[PDB]
Amino acid sequence: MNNYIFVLSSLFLVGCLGLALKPSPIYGGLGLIVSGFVGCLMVLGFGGSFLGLMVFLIYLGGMLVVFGYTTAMATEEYPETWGSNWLILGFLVLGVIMEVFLICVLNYYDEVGVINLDGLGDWLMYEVDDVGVMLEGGIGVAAMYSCATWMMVVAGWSLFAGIFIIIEITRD
Amino acid sequence: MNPITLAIIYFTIFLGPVITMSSTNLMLMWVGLEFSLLAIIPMLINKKNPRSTEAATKYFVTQATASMIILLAIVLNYKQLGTWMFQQQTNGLILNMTLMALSMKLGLAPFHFWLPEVTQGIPLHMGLILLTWQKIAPLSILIQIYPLLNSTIILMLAITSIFMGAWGGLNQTQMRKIMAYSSIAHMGWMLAILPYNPSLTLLNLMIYIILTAPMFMALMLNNSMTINSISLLWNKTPAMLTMISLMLLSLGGLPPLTGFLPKWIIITELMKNNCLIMATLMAMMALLNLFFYTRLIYSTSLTMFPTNNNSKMMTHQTKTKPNLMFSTLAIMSTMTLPLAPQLIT
Amino acid sequence: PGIVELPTLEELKVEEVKVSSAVLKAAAHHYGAQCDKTNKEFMLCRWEEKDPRRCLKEGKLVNGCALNFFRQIKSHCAEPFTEYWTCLDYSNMQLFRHCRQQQAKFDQCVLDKL
Amino acid sequence: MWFEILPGLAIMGVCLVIPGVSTAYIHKFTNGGKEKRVARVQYQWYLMERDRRISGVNRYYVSKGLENID
Amino acid sequence: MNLYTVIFINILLSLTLILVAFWLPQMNLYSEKANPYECGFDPTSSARLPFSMKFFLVAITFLLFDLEIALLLPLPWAIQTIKTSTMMIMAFILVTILSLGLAYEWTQKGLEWTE
Amino acid sequence: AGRISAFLKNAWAKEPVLVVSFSVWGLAIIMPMISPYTKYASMINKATPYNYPVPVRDDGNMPDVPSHPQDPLGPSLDWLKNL
Amino acid sequence: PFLDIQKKLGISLDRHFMFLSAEQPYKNAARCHAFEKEWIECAHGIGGTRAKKECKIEFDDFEECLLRYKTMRRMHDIKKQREKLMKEGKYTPPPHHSGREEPRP
Amino acid sequence: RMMRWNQERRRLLIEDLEARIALMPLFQAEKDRRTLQILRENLEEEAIIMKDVPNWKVGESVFHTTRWVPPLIGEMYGLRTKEEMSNANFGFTWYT
Amino acid sequence: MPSTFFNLTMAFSLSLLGTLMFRSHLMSTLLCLEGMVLSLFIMTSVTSLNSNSMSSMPIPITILVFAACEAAVGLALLVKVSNTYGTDYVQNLNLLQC
Amino acid sequence: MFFINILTLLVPILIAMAFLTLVERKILGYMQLRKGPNIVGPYGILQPFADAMKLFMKEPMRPLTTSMSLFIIAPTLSLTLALSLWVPLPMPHPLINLNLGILFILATSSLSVYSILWSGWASNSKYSLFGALRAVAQTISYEVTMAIILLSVLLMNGSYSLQTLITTQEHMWLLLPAWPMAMMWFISTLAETNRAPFDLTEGESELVSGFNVEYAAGPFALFFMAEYTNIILMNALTTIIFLGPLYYINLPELYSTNFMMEALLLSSTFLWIRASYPRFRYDQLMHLLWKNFLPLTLALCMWHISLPIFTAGVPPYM
Numbered sequence A: 001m002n003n004y005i006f007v008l009s010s011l012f013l014v015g016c017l018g019l020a021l022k023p024s025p026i027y028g029g030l031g032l033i034v035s036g037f038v039g040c041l042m043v044l045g046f047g048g049s050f051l052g053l054m055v056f057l058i059y060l061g062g063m064l065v066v067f068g069y070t071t072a073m074a075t076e077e078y079p080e081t082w083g084s085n086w087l088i089l090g091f092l093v094l095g096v097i098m099e100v101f102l103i104c105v106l107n108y109y110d111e112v113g114v115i116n117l118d119g120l121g122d123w124l125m126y127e128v129d130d131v132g133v134m135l136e137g138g139i140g141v142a143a144m145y146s147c148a149t150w151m152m153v154v155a156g157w158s159l160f161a162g163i164f165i166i167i168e169i170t171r172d
Numbered sequence B: 001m002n003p004i005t006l007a008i009i010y011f012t013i014f015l016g017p018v019i020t021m022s023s024t025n026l027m028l029m030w031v032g033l034e035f036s037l038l039a040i041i042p043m044l045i046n047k048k049n050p051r052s053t054e055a056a057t058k059y060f061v062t063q064a065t066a067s068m069i070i071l072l073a074i075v076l077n078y079k080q081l082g083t084w085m086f087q088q089q090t091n092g093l094i095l096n097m098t099l100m101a102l103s104m105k106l107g108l109a110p111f112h113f114w115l116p117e118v119t120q121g122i123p124l125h126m127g128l129i130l131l132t133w134q135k136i137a138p139l140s141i142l143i144q145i146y147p148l149l150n151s152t153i154i155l156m157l158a159i160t161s162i163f164m165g166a167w168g169g170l171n172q173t174q175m176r177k178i179m180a181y182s183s184i185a186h187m188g189w190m191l192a193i194l195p196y197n198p199s200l201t202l203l204n205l206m207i208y209i210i211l212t213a214p215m216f217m218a219l220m221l222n223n224s225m226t227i228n229s230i231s232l233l234w235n236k237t238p239a240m241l242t243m244i245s246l247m248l249l250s251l252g253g254l255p256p257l258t259g260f261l262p263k264w265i266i267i268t269e270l271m272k273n274n275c276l277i278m279a280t281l282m283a284m285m286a287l288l289n290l291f292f293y294t295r296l297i298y299s300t301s302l303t304m305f306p307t308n309n310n311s312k313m314m315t316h317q318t319k320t321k322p323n324l325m326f327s328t329l330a331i332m333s334t335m336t337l338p339l340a341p342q343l344i345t
Numbered sequence C: 001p002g003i004v005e006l007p008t009l010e011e012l013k014v015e016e017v018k019v020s021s022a023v024l025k026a027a028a029h030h031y032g033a034q035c036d037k038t039n040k041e042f043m044l045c046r047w048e049e050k051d052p053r054r055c056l057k058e059g060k061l062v063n064g065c066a067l068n069f070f071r072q073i074k075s076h077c078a079e080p081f082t083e084y085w086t087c088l089d090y091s092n093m094q095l096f097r098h099c100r101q102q103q104a105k106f107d108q109c110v111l112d113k114l
Numbered sequence D: 001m002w003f004e005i006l007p008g009l010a011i012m013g014v015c016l017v018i019p020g021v022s023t024a025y026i027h028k029f030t031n032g033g034k035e036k037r038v039a040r041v042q043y044q045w046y047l048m049e050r051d052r053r054i055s056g057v058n059r060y061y062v063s064k065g066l067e068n069i070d
Numbered sequence E: 001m002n003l004y005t006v007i008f009i010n011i012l013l014s015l016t017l018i019l020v021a022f023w024l025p026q027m028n029l030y031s032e033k034a035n036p037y038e039c040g041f042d043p044t045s046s047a048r049l050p051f052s053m054k055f056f057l058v059a060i061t062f063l064l065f066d067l068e069i070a071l072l073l074p075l076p077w078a079i080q081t082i083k084t085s086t087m088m089i090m091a092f093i094l095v096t097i098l099s100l101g102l103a104y105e106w107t108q109k110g111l112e113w114t115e
Numbered sequence F: 001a002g003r004i005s006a007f008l009k010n011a012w013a014k015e016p017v018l019v020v021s022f023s024v025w026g027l028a029i030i031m032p033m034i035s036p037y038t039k040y041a042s043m044i045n046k047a048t049p050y051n052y053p054v055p056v057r058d059d060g061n062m063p064d065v066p067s068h069p070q071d072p073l074g075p076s077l078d079w080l081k082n083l
Numbered sequence G: 001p002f003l004d005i006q007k008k009l010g011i012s013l014d015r016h017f018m019f020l021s022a023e024q025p026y027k028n029a030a031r032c033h034a035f036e037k038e039w040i041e042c043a044h045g046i047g048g049t050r051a052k053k054e055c056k057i058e059f060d061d062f063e064e065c066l067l068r069y070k071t072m073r074r075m076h077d078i079k080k081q082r083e084k085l086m087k088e089g090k091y092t093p094p095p096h097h098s099g100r101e102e103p104r105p
Numbered sequence H: 001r002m003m004r005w006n007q008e009r010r011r012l013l014i015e016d017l018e019a020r021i022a023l024m025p026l027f028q029a030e031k032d033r034r035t036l037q038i039l040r041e042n043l044e045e046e047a048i049i050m051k052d053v054p055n056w057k058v059g060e061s062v063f064h065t066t067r068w069v070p071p072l073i074g075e076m077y078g079l080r081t082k083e084e085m086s087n088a089n090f091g092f093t094w095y096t
Numbered sequence I: 001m002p003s004t005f006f007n008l009t010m011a012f013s014l015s016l017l018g019t020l021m022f023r024s025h026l027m028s029t030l031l032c033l034e035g036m037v038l039s040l041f042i043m044t045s046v047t048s049l050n051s052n053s054m055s056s057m058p059i060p061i062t063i064l065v066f067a068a069c070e071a072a073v074g075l076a077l078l079v080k081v082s083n084t085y086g087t088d089y090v091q092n093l094n095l096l097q098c
Numbered sequence J: 001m002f003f004i005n006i007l008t009l010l011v012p013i014l015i016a017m018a019f020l021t022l023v024e025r026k027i028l029g030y031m032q033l034r035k036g037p038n039i040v041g042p043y044g045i046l047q048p049f050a051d052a053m054k055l056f057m058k059e060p061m062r063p064l065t066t067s068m069s070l071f072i073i074a075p076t077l078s079l080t081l082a083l084s085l086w087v088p089l090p091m092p093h094p095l096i097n098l099n100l101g102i103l104f105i106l107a108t109s110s111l112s113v114y115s116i117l118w119s120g121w122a123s124n125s126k127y128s129l130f131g132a133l134r135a136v137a138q139t140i141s142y143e144v145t146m147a148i149i150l151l152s153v154l155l156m157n158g159s160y161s162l163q164t165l166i167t168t169q170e171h172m173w174l175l176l177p178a179w180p181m182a183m184m185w186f187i188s189t190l191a192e193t194n195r196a197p198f199d200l201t202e203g204e205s206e207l208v209s210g211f212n213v214e215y216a217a218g219p220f221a222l223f224f225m226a227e228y229t230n231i232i233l234m235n236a237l238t239t240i241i242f243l244g245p246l247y248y249i250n251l252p253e254l255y256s257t258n259f260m261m262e263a264l265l266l267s268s269t270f271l272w273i274r275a276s277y278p279r280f281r282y283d284q285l286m287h288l289l290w291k292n293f294l295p296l297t298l299a300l301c302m303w304h305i306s307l308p309i310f311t312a313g314v315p316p317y318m
């Protein structure tokens, strides 16, 4: 229960490795969905649930549209997965081996640098308000409605101008 | 484009760099960069040809990658220092990543490979909007963090920018590619003077903008995209040859044109900071830039290339295209050297 | 740098209130009304002197006032308060609105007495 | 007729009342005659942990009243 | 811990069901058994070919609208603010801008499907 | 105008969803500007005590703040109790 | 910023959440609020170069609070020495560090 | 009906928060006393463990300032059991 | 937290490496961009939750909003590329060299 | 004891799903002037067990063109997400008490859509591809509209928890203040659960079987269980949100009984609707949810932003 966050971070690294290795975009979207779920779990473990659930929902919608698009136009007769190419699968297992080697090197040589296996699970939650109401992560995002109205208006104008932009690009 | 979407797109194009320059927060500067990129893509792809589609795609992926590296630098600084500004003690790796990503957004060598290609295939007014307006916000971000940057990496980027711009402008015949390599060389000069005196960076930027604007307007008069196309300008608009020659010589940095002033004062400041080798190499590559400008002048003004038969009908027709702001910018970019102490601060 | 100076277990020893949260919430309003001055002194010293080691005397005074308050309740109003905190303890949130008859009887007892 | 549906409806009704009733009874049984405490905020979680420390049996639901006060 | 336990129990239950479904019945598979289904005839072409999408603009609009939803979702905590006038004005502006974008796309026939 | 009313009736007959949407939008815009309870929402949110009221050090110079919570001085919530 | 339109107009579009010790919702103090406040109070009015030279103590305290590098090193050294003493067997944990203690509220 | 019931709910929430406010000084005193006790026994254990380590100051702070720095969860539960550490880290998050 | 942040930084580095090392699929390049975005979001969110910076908690949502606008424009450009060529091949997007 | 609680949640939900299949057969038959199953068992009550046993003793299909990994992964994913969506519902006490319950519901529903999509793509068939693309369009439309609906309802409620919804409806149903968005939420749940007229993914007449046209036996059973568990799930969510059962602190059995009766009524309404109406065309579903529901949903969202402000009925945080 100490290395739970580290296991999640390693799974996120593996998912990003597969996404970098670039299979067919169906499998790329699958890896991105798994990475988004893992990142949601990481934000959940580190603190408020709202940011993790938000990025989860956003990436579910995004990879849904991506799946529709890759079935539309970014497809091939034989879609390429991680196991179809010997070079891609070799790069996958080599990246896993390199990750294990790098975390062992940072455990041994660098001592307490970025990775410490003895200190793992000790520095996840630094300071928490033991007694207290109004502490959850969604309240800051709510404070965007009051404290950062400039942030609110630039986000809203980004979405509005984006609607106009996509209409003009796909106007044809 | 209906006027509603014209107003929305042009207002967001304007608003991007304005937010970037006025923003205290690095995140708001970043979203200003996002505004500029997203708003300028549809006007790039507005003509809906395969070349415009390729140019828009290349520009999008390049600026998106560079903006992601910028966001990485911002998030790493926020992790290290807890604030949203590179104050004084941010990591040199973070600052170098910021510089590298902003140089890829600007389009200076060796990150320059997309800029002649994006400048090609888009209309001339969009090339003007790109090569003048799109560089102000990244330069503002670089200017805000001038004492923190690394002089070695900046000078290397600047010298390779001026070298590659000189060689590319030497090779190309397409006018948009020539202007893009000119942009690369002048961005190299601006980056070279950036860590020592950003006032000279702003001066060189303003001189380059007021020199680039009427050259693009004169190209926009007849849609002359080629050396030959600008070479038969004597039959079409004979009254513009002198101003074309003067503006190209000012771009070359020849005295007594006012375009000699940015190179002169940048060299002076580098000599004050004891970078004589860099200054001399930059000046020689600026001579190469002046060479391809002079070949352009030979093609369009000093000689007279053969004309066509339909140019008689084009002379029968009348035009109202050159606007009121062309001559003001041409004169202010040609004959303003005696006001050099006023142009500098 | 210099070493940190923090008090010992003998200085931190006090008669703690071995009283459950439902019991505390049942006696909450009268504890906030009767032991208000000592509690406000402790909060003032804590929010003026940020160091918690400068307020151990005030914390012990707060514990003593709470102990005296609960001893007075046990002396005079034991059974209505007992059933009141039991009925409060049944609820998962310990909502005051679920138990109002027991609250009324406890309030009547601590109004006619004390 | 239309009342032959009622056996399947009754089986569905029993299978839908079982989870909620059983969950309430299991919460009451595992928390000792009281509902399972909800800690939606850090204050409520701190109350639950304080009760767990106070009880002396490492169970928050064992409440201590005035019998611990002299 | 309890949520993780019940998620793992669901995973184990479904894996057990599919495992017993694959290892319990008798296997007899041949080429015509496992050929793809095209209503009794052979497929003319592979199903991995490009398959045109007539609501792609609506999908991009769905991306933008989903992010508008993400912006609107902290409202139940935003209504607890002291300055309710600023929150109310900002929420009204956001919903009105979203509605104007939808109306503009409806006017420009972006909601209609191509061909 | 008669033509405006005829257009409105035609819209209400044929496309009532948009008419209801625009009417609800207008009512949501104009209703807080005319309701007398609008200030009460902000006052309730201000009166909700999420944070501890940190006591102030009395130098004997401010007479307005109460010495005890059960004092006549201070922001009472009788308006909320009778609301 | 490159342009000071916010300072000229007196508005604060983004200047009020530039750091941890800025305005916070419901007065929830961020971590190292005191350290960052001390660093800004030191560095204000003297410029960046003098702030780097002379407020090094405040910056180092703030950085140590934020990243806790030395705290991690100290705790790792304590735990490594403890496990070495356990391996050579000349040390036993106290009861209150081994799970059985007398809890206090 | 929703307006009236929400106003009643607001009054009940204010009553609950006032009960929390009335109980808060005792909880604060108990919490800082417990934190000081845990830090004290950790300091004593550090004195026992690293008495033979050269150039080691027992209880040396990592801050130049002498004001109070509230200890981290890792500071006050580093030397205790892993189950107690996990309870301090993930207890509220994993209690559903 | 430091091991987690190092792993997130390496995840961003891998996604950037994937973006910089093209294969035939522009959609796969856009997916690598979205992976970079996801790593940035997780880093910002865990930094804000670790430092209790509720004032800076709107920043990850703003990152998601602008990045989704980026992805939307990328999908529109991929639509135009596929209408031009029939595929999303960056090897087909090459005729601007001369 | 927690494992026993898991069992007494999971097993009765599965039996209620199977008897929902039976009761759908009976109700559809009696609405179609016939009887439905009454031979297999006393009154047909052994028919779902017969169907389950037949499907789990029939051999599965592993087509040659089919991606085996995703073909296996999709149905178990669908069943796990159905049970996971069932887990946090309060009746009146949930097995897993969450703060952002409806956000968990939305995430798990979208992941179930992904299970359908991956099944359709893995089963390398053109009808499966049609089912996947129709699922994409359907979930686009209902996702945006249902998200705004739930946002407005919880703005009236005040928090994302569901015990808070019980406390909100302690005195009155939310159907009375929010009945237009209750109707739109009901249609959204129909489209989410892929029930007629918005099924469009297991298209019986348009396609052959759609996304599960290559699935046979066991995995097909898993898909059917996931779908009908989602039917009972979404109707239970609808009656928790809008038709608040009577809740008393001293006895929760009354709440469980009232919840059961209203959930049975809503499920029977689902079967009634399937009997009554013909199927939509899947572009008409998108046009409906984007041209009629969505503008009205935005207007009502603005109205529910304004309403507690000008009525001072801002809901409590807790």
Ligand SMILES: CCCCCCCCCCCCCCCCCC(=O)OC[C@H](COP(=O)([O-])OCC[N+](C)(C)C)OC(=O)CCCCCCCCCCCCCCCCC
Pocket (backbone or CB within 6 Å): F015, F017, F020, F023, F024, J175, J180, J182, J183, J184, J186, J187, J197, J238, J242, J273, J277, J288, J291, J292, J293, J296
């Ligand atoms: C859970 C609670 C109960 C929910 C209802 C459950 C029982 C009823 C179920 C019926 C069966 C449904 C099966 C699926 C049907 C699918 C078709 C369908 O519904 O299409 C939607 C139809 C669509 O109509 P249409 O498509 O025929 O219309 C044509 C539209 N054009 C031309 C643009 C294509 O209706 C709606 O969209 C209406 C949605 C509900 C609107 C409610 C408004 C109420 C009034 C608001 C306030 C008005 C006053 C404002 C203030 C004035 C002040 C002066």
Ligand SMILES: CCCCCCCCCCCCCCCCCC(=O)OC[C@H](COP(=O)(O)OCCN)OC(=O)CCCCCCCCCCCCCCCCC
Pocket (backbone or CB within 6 Å): A040, A041, A044, A049, D039, D040, E001, E003, E004, E007, E008, E011, H092, H093, H094, H095, H096, J076, J077, J080, J081, J084, J097, J098, J099, J100, J104, J107, J108, J111
């Ligand atoms: C076939 C493969 C299937 C892969 C996908 C599996 C999907 C599972 C079901 C859908 C999950 C959707 C995402 C849920 C994320 C967590 C939601 C949430 O809000 O959790 C918060 C909750 C407690 O937080 P809160 O509500 O704030 O309460 C604090 C005070 N009580 O609770 C917590 O904090 C607990 C944190 C952990 C919760 C998630 C546990 C997931 C377990 C791993 C599943 C996958 C295992 C790997 C694959 C196995 C082999 C196939």
